[PDB]
Amino acid sequence: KETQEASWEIFTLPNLNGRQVAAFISSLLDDPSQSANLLAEAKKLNDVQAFLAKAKEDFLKKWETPSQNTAQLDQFDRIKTLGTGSFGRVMLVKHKESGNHYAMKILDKQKVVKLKQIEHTLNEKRILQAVNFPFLVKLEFSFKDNSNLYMVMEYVAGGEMFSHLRRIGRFSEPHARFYAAQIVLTFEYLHSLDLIYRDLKPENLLIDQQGYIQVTDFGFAKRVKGRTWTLCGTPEYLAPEIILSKGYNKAVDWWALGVLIYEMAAGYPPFFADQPIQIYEKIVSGKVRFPSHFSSDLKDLLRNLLQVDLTKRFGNLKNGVNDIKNHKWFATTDWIAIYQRKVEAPFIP
Amino acid sequence: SALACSAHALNLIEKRTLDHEEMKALNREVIEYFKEHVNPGFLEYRKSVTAGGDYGAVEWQAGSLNTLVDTQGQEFIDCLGGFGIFNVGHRNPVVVSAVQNQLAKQPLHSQELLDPLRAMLAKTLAALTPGKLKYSFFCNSGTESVEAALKLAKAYQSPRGKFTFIATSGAFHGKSLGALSATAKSTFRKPFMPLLPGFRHVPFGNIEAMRTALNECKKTGDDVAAVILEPIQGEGGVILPPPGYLTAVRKLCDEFGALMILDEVQTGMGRTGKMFACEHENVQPDILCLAKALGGGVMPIGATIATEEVFSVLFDNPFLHTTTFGGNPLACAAALATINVLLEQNLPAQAEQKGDMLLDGFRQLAREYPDLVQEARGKGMLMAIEFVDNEIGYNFASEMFRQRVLVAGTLNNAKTIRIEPPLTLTIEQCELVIKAARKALAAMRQQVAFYEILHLPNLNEEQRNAFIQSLKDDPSQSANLLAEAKKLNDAQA
Amino acid sequence: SALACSAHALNLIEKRTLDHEEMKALNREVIEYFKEHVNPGFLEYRKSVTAGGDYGAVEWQAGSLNTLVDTQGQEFIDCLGGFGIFNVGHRNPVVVSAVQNQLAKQPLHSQELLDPLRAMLAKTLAALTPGKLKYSFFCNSGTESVEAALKLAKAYQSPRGKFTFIATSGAFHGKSLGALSATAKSTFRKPFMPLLPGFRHVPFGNIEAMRTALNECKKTGDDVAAVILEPIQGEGGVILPPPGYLTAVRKLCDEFGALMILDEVQTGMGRTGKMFACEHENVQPDILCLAKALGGGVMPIGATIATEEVFSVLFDNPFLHTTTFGGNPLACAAALATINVLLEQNLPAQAEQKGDMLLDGFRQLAREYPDLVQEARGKGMLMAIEFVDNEIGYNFASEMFRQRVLVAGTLNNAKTIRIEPPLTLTIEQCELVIKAARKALAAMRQQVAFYEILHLPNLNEEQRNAFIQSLKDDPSQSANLLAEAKKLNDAQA
Numbered sequence A: 001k002e003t004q005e006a007s008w009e010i011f012t013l014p015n016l017n018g019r020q021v022a023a024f025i026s027s028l029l030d031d032p033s034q035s036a037n038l039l040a041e042a043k044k045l046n047d048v049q050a051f052l053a054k055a056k057e058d059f060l061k062k063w064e065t066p067s068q069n070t071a072q073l074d075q076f077d078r079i080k081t082l083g084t085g086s087f088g089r090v091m092l093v094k095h096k097e098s099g100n101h102y103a104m105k106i107l108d109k110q111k112v113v114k115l116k117q118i119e120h121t122l123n124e125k126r127i128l129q130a131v132n133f134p135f136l137v138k139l140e141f142s143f144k145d146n147s148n149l150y151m152v153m154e155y156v157a158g159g160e161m162f163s164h165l166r167r168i169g170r171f172s173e174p175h176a177r178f179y180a181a182q183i184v185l186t187f188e189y190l191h192s193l194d195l196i197y198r199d200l201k202p203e204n205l206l207i208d209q210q211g212y213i214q215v216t217d218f219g220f221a222k223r224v225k226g227r228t229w230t231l232c233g234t235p236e237y238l239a240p241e242i243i244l245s246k247g248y249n250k251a252v253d254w255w256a257l258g259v260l261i262y263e264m265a266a267g268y269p270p271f272f273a274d275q276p277i278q279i280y281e282k283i284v285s286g287k288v289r290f291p292s293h294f295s296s297d298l299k300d301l302l303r304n305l306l307q308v309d310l311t312k313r314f315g316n317l318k319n320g321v322n323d324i325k326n327h328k329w330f331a332t333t334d335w336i337a338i339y340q341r342k343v344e345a346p347f348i349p
Numbered sequence B, C: 001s002a003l004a005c006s007a008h009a010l011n012l013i014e015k016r017t018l019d020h021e022e023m024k025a026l027n028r029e030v031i032e033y034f035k036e037h038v039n040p041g042f043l044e045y046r047k048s049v050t051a052g053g054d055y056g057a058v059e060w061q062a063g064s065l066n067t068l069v070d071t072q073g074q075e076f077i078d079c080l081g082g083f084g085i086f087n088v089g090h091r092n093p094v095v096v097s098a099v100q101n102q103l104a105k106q107p108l109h110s111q112e113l114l115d116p117l118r119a120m121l122a123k124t125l126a127a128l129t130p131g132k133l134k135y136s137f138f139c140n141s142g143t144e145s146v147e148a149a150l151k152l153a154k155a156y157q158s159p160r161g162k163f164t165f166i167a168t169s170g171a172f173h174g175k176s177l178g179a180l181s182a183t184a185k186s187t188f189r190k191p192f193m194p195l196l197p198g199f200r201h202v203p204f205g206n207i208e209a210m211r212t213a214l215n216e217c218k219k220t221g222d223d224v225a226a227v228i229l230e231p232i233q234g235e236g237g238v239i240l241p242p243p244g245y246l247t248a249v250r251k252l253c254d255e256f257g258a259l260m261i262l263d264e265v266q267t268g269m270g271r272t273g274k275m276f277a278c279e280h281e282n283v284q285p286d287i288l289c290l291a292k293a294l295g296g297g298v299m300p301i302g303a304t305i306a307t308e309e310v311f312s313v314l315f316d317n318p319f320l321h322t323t324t325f326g327g328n329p330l331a332c333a334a335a336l337a338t339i340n341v342l343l344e345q346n347l348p349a350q351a352e353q354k355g356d357m358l359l360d361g362f363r364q365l366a367r368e369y370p371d372l373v374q375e376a377r378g379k380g381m382l383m384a385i386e387f388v389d390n391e392i393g394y395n396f397a398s399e400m401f402r403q404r405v406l407v408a409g410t411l412n413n414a415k416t417i418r419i420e421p422p423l424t425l426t427i428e429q430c431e432l433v434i435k436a437a438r439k440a441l442a443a444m445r446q447q448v449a450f451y452e453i454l455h456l457p458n459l460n461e462e463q464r465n466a467f468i469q470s471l472k473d474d475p476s477q478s479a480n481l482l483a484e485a486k487k488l489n490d491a492q493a
Helices: A002-011 A018-030 A035-064 A109-115 A118-130 A161-168 A173-192 A240-244 A251-266 A277-284 A296-305 A335-340 B002-014 B020-038 B093-105 B116-128 B142-160 B186-192 B207-219 B245-255 B308-315 B329-344 B347-368 B390-402 B427-454 B461-473 B480-489 C002-014 C020-038 C093-105 C116-128 C142-160 C186-192 C207-219 C245-255 C308-315 C329-344 C347-368 C390-402 C427-454 C461-473 C480-489
Strands: A076-084 A088-095 A101-108 A139-144 A148-154 A205-207 A213-215 B059-062 B067-070 B075-078 B133-139 B164-169 B199-203 B224-229 B259-263 B287-290 B302-307 B373-379 B382-387 B416-419 C059-062 C067-070 C075-078 C133-139 C164-169 C199-203 C224-229 C259-263 C287-290 C302-307 C373-379 C382-387 C416-419
Touching (some): A002 A018, A002 B427, A018 B461, A109 A148, A118 A148, A161 A205, A240 A251, A251 A296, B059 C093, B093 B329, B093 C059, B116 C002, B116 C020, B133 C020, B142 B287, B142 B302, B142 C142, B142 C186, B164 B207, B329 C002, B427 B480, C075 C427, C093 C329, C133 C308, C142 C224, C142 C287, C142 C302, C142 C308, C164 C207, C207 C224, C224 C245, C329 C347, C347 C427, C390 C427, C427 C461, C427 C480
Parallel strands (some): B164 B199
Antiparallel strands (some): B067 B075, C067 C075, C382 C416
């Protein structure tokens, strides 16, 4: 009976399907000892998916009719000029009403049109405007005038992961576990809104004042329902399907995670050659032999994520995201606490 | 201080709406007090707390005629009607103003000066009641009703050497020691025994039996003073007696010179189709007990109407049986209002068409789920569904509670549930109810089936999982997948 | 038709004043109906018709807090207070609006959802009651009060093998069969016997007696379940027990493990000076019965408060003792209003100063007419004058009725009259009363003397006529002329 109580509670979860519940019932039937732990997990899962419901509804609302001119230029005071690109330049600004600091991106309308970047710009903005997740850069304001476009971004001090990875050389697996876990949750979120990210690389990973991650480039991300073909991205992180020129989907993101983890734990990418065409060869017939210091569990996950057989790839099975969340390498990670930001950062810049 | 507690409750009466934390506040005191000053048990066995939610469902105010709204704003359809109280609905505008008028003039009487409304009610009731029932006595409840009836019969019959009283098994008549001597359930009686000497029970609906009781008593010199019964056993589970019974009891009484007492406490005031249930067989008792719905859900009241021959006992010493609050003006008000409404919008006639559309509606549901329901039954707007288990029954009563449809049954006594919505239930709310009970019956069948799939011993986990999968994905197949699992479990048997 | 009779009474509720023939009309129906549907006896024995006048004194509406106005417009001072009902006066504005508020929200409860006012009252009463009295049960009257008390004691004590109940001679506790087993007057009990087995009466105020009852019962294996008594016998004629009695009963109970039940139905709610009479000797009972004035003369109500040790019986099966209307919201309202008023304007304290000024006022009158009054007695605003005859008594109660001062007593039971005016009686109305009783006592003494002069046999007509002459010309000499006539009748003896 005591077990039967926890059984019903698992089945009463509306957010959970037949497959999910039947999985918590089995474990209960087989382990009436972990009854409380099995019912607990069931509740996390339910709750967890439920929120994704509120996340999508909230996304579409903004995705459908997007915000425009949420601020104007004479609401800020130029402090310093942080950086310059081809689009224009980024300045540190102070919001006169609050005294808050942002990194405003000025991009010359006419310079964009030349660089043939009209779509990327529009798509990046429309995505950023609609998105909401802790590990993503937050577009606070957005506007334009006669001469240029303005994207007012939450300023976060701390370099790229690329340059930082050069400094340390390689991260200890607990360090890489902390970064992976964030990219995972980020990807869960984005996939939910039917968005491929398509541009995961250390360069697109900024580090929080809090030492957590912020994901920073969206020129490539697509709201894809079925399959797409545009190839964009860095050779090392392309899934074989991209190269091979057969349609792809959100699976591609999960491949890149694999590559990203490998690099953080090894100090170099798994498929690497002097010249690219060659990097593709090595990717397609996907033989990836690990370093010696690589944990067998970490090896098991990488063998799963880096899998040319996209019907055999972790991320796109029936349990989807949960497969690598429940993997042996991620037993020591508290996902919801990672989410809250209540986990001790391994490094603060 | 008591001064403190009085004021806080006094200001809350004045408040008409609540902030969500003003709500939270309330519900936690009310649970707290119920545990420490009322009964902790009502928190254990009642469906308002078991299925309460995060908070219990504390009452707040009436919605429409048929609806009730708790402290959270959740609106409930009353298919309980306070167990036969709310016959003209909650706060029936015609009753509420008759009360509020009378409240402006004089709420209670002095007990020395001829109070006019007690004449008017005594008169009206004389008019409204079949045959030679002429005099009304007025008390406060259904139990005080029966008690006075017992007292009338007694004072009448004891000079004639008759002391025994036949009542019927399953009969409910009141919880006060006198009525509890005629009330029949074991549970209700045992702790307080010894009760009144000389009360003997016979089976209900059995005229062959009651002859033998009346005759055995005759032979042994213990002749029967009076026979007391309800037209339908209400609490007794909506037991309908065989056609002709009430008429045949009436002769049997007349044959042995025994007074006939009719407890129309729960079937009075138009619930069964007629103004009084004893009109379906056109039977006139010597005494008639009324209450509940006589007070239009506004006031508490009980009336005892009797023939002149019988009520004469009280004539020579009118103080022999008094009560302090009986027949007070504003209770009187309420009844005349209720009696007026019932004859005006002619609600006994409504009771019969809504009472058959509903009940049929239930015995249909009852064919579709014979694995959860033995039977549905009723007569006009008094009806009940009988389940197989108290487990199941409390599960039905509770399930619909959450569907914001308020029905009977408590945690343990719940095998048979009673449906007693106001006679003012709209045809729109009428379906909404049969619909809610259909959803409810589905969900329970799901859960019932769910367990059935699990202890299938010959069935392996691999197969069981496939069923549980399709069960959650398609609760409609709860019957199909079940049959498929049982057929599979027998294949490996 | 009943439809007809309902409407006519319904429109009369609406009417607030009456044309003199609209009056005549009324009073004649009301007498007519009382004779044919209520009781003809109340027309025979009541002072409202005997001394009615051309018409009876049919009630109409409340005057001020202490006054009542009939259908002719005659305003009465209530020194009856509905036999201890109207403690805070008629239509106390604070109670009437608490009721009318609650009437706007929800008059009666559903019986499924935790009703908030029953917690608040249960709480307040816990606060208001001495010692470990914690749980309240709610019913509708004073009789239902005692019945539940008997039931609590029973359910508590029968598992411990104790079934006998001691009550006291002269005790009144209710007219319903259970309470009537403890009520003591012959008249009230005899027709309905046999009542509950195992109730034995002892003399009131006699601790020496009650020991012997409790002990005899012990010896014979009929051990006492509970002892039930009123703090003052109210109806019993305002009998005051000897100082120390209630305290000494309380130990006697504790010694024999018998529950102590206190019937504070007529001495509760501040009438005797304290909120509860059992506070004068600071005695805590196991059970406390309340009613009457708990409903602020607006609502009917009864409360049964008990220790936790005793009320526990109902915890495990909370449905063991229910009532249909008990604790309904708007009755609850009324009490909290009444409880608030009583503590605010601190009316128990008023009860003691008005209660001694009055009573002293009566025992003065009682010295001046020792030929018509044996004694006056009371405790706070519960008091009574004892005359020598029922003849005389009904003559007092009746005389003042015409002086528009409403006191107790009926045609036969009237030897001792009871004075129970509202606790809100002004000092102005306070004299007006003692004044009215002085006029009354004069006029009766006149008539008494008048006859005395006539059967003086030795006295001749010539002399008798001289006395009758000066008697009518000087009613003040009614005592002098009398003595002169008796002295003269003895001269010719």
